[PDB]
């Protein structure tokens, strides 16, 4: 009873238990022998990802082979992806398969011909940023409405085909179902995209974590500083945030939620005023920054998770009016 989401708070409790009780989920595991691996795309602590071809129909796909011991976590990701079926700009799960001999599981996703983000983010126009952020927000509003927090929003997990103008939010392996008053593990998200709640060990967080991460992405795009908050470790990450948002403002947040602050911070936080967002503007980024971009950003990058815009409120902001007009 410390904090709850302003939107979609009870949505899982209003659904059948089967919807959110992923430990009880029984996937249907098809045959990986239908897929030919063509090229390694990446590796992570839990998986390796390959471009592949379905030899039965010639479809190009991506196969994520799961390090197989994490059974509850596999069920979680599979159930989440089933529940998100058809969601706007969510990567499409085509099938759940196993090597028929070893029984190692894998997930098969639609292919996206993505443009490497480091390159891409140096060439985006003002309209491009509005467009891609609006499309990403559609995915977040969808998953939040489905009772799910992504918990790993970051540029790599936002595939963008800049030629076909397609965006997909990938890598649901850290995602979780939101339940009011539930305490969650704070060891989620990439360092640079972790909300202050995670950095101060506040476990009663919600969908608004993803809105901090989105705000970090927005700042990086309009200001051309990627990542925007570049901490050296989790402690320094909060310091970098506080140098922008201010230290007195941090303490007000902690007091509101009765958050205990790890005393190692006492020696490193210093004293910082809250900075004006206009301080980040210079000749190299001025064409990407508007009053409406800064107003939106200011309402996303807030310590107080409750006061951040929801994905829907963000979509409704004037910054996106030019995109809505084109889509209509
Ligand atoms: Br899922 C997925 N994961 C990837 N990792 N690197 N490129 C990737 C693509 Br494209 C997809 Br689709």
């Amino acid at each position: 009873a410390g904090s709850r989401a302003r939107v979609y708070a009870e949505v899982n409790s209003l659904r059948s238990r089967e919807y959110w009780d992923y430990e009880a989920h029984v996937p249907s595991w098809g045959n990986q022998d239908d897929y030919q691996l063509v090229r390694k795309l990446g590796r992570g602590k839990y998986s390796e990802v390959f471009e592949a071809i379905n030899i039965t129909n010639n479809e190009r796909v991506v196969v994520k082979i799961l390090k197989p011991v994490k059974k509850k976590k596999i069920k979680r990701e599979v159930k989440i992806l089933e529940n998100l079926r058809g969601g706007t700009n969510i990567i499409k799960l085509i099938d759940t398969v196993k090597d028929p001999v070893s029984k190692t599981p894998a997930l098969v996703f639609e292919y996206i011909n993505n443009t490497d983000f480091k390159q891409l983010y140096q060439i985006l126009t003002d309209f491009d940023i509005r467009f891609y952020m609006y499309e990403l927000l559609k995915a977040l509003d969808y998953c939040h409405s489905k009772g799910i927090m992504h918990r790993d929003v970051k540029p790599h997990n936002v595939m963008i085909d800049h030629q076909q103008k397609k965006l997909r939010l990938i890598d649901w392996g850290l995602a979780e179902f939101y339940h009011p008053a539930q305490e969650y593990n704070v060891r989620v998200a990439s360092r640079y995209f972790k909300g202050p709640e995670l950095l101060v060990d506040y476990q009663m967080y919600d969908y608004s974590l993803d809105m901090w991460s989105l705000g970090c992405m927005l700042a990086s795009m309009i200001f051309r500083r990627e990542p925007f908050f570049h901490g050296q470790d989790n402690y320094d990450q909060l310091v970098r945030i506080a140098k922008v948002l201010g230290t007195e403002e941090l303490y007000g947040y902690l007091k509101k939620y009765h958050i205990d602050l790890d005393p190692h911070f006492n020696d490193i936080l210093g004293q910082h005023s809250r900075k004006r967002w206009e301080n980040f503007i210079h000749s190299e980024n001025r064409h990407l920054v508007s009053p409406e971009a800064l107003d939106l950003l200011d309402k996303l990058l807030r310590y107080d998770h409750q006061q951040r815009l929801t994905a829907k409120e963000a979509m409704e902001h004037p910054y996106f009016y030019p995109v809505v007009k084109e889509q209509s």
Side-chain angles (χ1 to χ4, degrees):
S3 179
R4 66 166 54 205
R6 288 192 296 109
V7 290
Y8 297 123
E10 296 286 353
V11 73
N12 292 324
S13 73
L14 294 180
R15 293 177 178 125
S16 300
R17 171 169 174 186
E18 171 173 345
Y19 180 86
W20 51 260
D21 184 5
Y22 58 85
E23 293 193 55
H25 184 53
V26 180
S28 181
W29 293 104
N31 194 333
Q32 190 182 127
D33 288 2
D34 287 344
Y35 297 91
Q36 171 64 51
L37 308 182
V38 166
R39 173 174 25 260
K40 192 174 177 170
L41 299 181
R43 196 186 58 173
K45 64 185 78 159
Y46 299 118
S47 68
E48 195 166 30
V49 180
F50 297 85
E51 190 179 324
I53 303 288
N54 181 328
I55 70 166
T56 73
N57 63 13
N58 309 304
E59 185 185 17
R60 189 175 311 272
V61 301
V62 171
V63 178
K64 179 186 176 172
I65 302 181
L66 304 169
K67 303 187 161 74
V69 174
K70 223 86 165 188
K71 164 171 168 99
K72 175 175 174 186
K73 193 181 174 302
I74 291 168
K75 288 179 187 294
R76 187 178 69 183
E77 180 175 3
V78 169
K79 186 65 186 183
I80 283 175
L81 289 163
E82 164 174 293
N83 289 344
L84 296 174
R85 185 170 162 279
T88 305
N89 296 334
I90 296 180
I91 193 67
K92 181 173 63 173
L93 180 67
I94 292 171
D95 203 9
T96 49
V97 302
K98 281 175 172 179
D99 172 324
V101 182
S102 69
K103 311 302 189 290
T104 296
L107 307 181
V108 183
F109 296 99
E110 67 185 335
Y111 175 76
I112 303 288
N113 195 338
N114 68 298
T115 307
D116 193 293
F117 76 87
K118 273 295 196 183
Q119 298 301 72
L120 178 62
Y121 287 21
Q122 87 203 333
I123 65 164
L124 297 166
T125 70
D126 178 29
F127 187 83
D128 292 331
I129 297 169
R130 295 176 195 233
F131 177 86
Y132 290 127
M133 284 283 110
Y134 192 72
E135 295 301 312
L136 177 57
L137 282 163
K138 292 176 182 172
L140 291 175
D141 184 51
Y142 191 88
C143 71
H144 296 167
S145 80
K146 292 307 283 205
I148 291 155
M149 308 174 276
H150 183 281
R151 310 195 303 177
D152 197 20
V153 172
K154 62 180 179 174
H156 172 76
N157 288 339
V158 180
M159 295 291 87
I160 295 172
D161 174 344
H162 189 53
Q163 285 74 51
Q164 297 191 43
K165 316 303 187 178
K166 293 167 67 176
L167 178 149
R168 299 290 187 273
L169 180 55
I170 66 157
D171 205 349
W172 297 81
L174 286 181
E176 199 34 289
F177 291 89
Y178 178 71
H179 297 284
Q182 185 156 322
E183 289 181 324
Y184 293 95
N185 192 332
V186 300
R187 295 176 178 271
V188 298
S190 154
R191 184 190 307 144
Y192 312 124
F193 301 90
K194 289 172 186 288
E197 56 271 50
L198 306 181
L199 300 169
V200 302
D201 312 298
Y202 184 73
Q203 297 191 263
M204 203 175 290
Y205 64 76
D206 61 66
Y207 315 112
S208 60
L209 168 62
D210 291 334
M211 299 308 298
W212 176 271
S213 309
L214 187 139
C216 290
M217 291 183 59
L218 178 65
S220 73
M221 291 184 173
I222 71 175
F223 294 134
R224 305 179 72 196
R225 182 167 86 185
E226 202 301 306
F228 188 71
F229 293 121
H230 200 136
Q232 291 302 86
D233 54 56
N234 288 345
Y235 287 107
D236 187 56
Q237 188 67 28
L238 185 63
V239 176
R240 302 311 187 107
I241 294 166
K243 287 182 174 192
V244 180
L245 280 61
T247 45
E248 292 300 304
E249 293 81 1
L250 172 64
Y251 303 140
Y253 170 57
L254 301 175
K255 178 60 171 294
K256 170 169 178 185
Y257 293 98
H258 309 304
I259 297 172
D260 293 330
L261 190 68
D262 178 337
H264 180 59
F265 280 114
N266 299 345
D267 294 313
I268 60 174
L269 271 174
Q271 297 164 127
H272 302 284
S273 64
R274 172 168 206 102
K275 306 303 185 301
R276 299 183 62 245
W277 293 112
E278 295 80 355
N279 293 0
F280 297 96
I281 302 172
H282 64 115
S283 72
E284 293 177 348
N285 65 24
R286 177 169 304 109
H287 63 293
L288 307 175
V289 182
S290 58
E292 61 272 21
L294 293 187
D295 184 67
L296 173 59
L297 185 64
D298 186 55
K299 292 165 170 172
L300 297 170
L301 293 182
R302 293 177 155 168
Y303 289 118
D304 190 336
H305 55 280
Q306 287 196 6
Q307 296 184 336
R308 298 177 195 144
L309 301 187
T310 65
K312 174 180 174 50
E313 290 163 350
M315 287 178 67
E316 287 166 343
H317 190 280
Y319 179 67
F320 298 112
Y321 176 62
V323 178
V324 175
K325 200 181 199 156
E326 285 283 316
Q327 296 193 347
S328 306

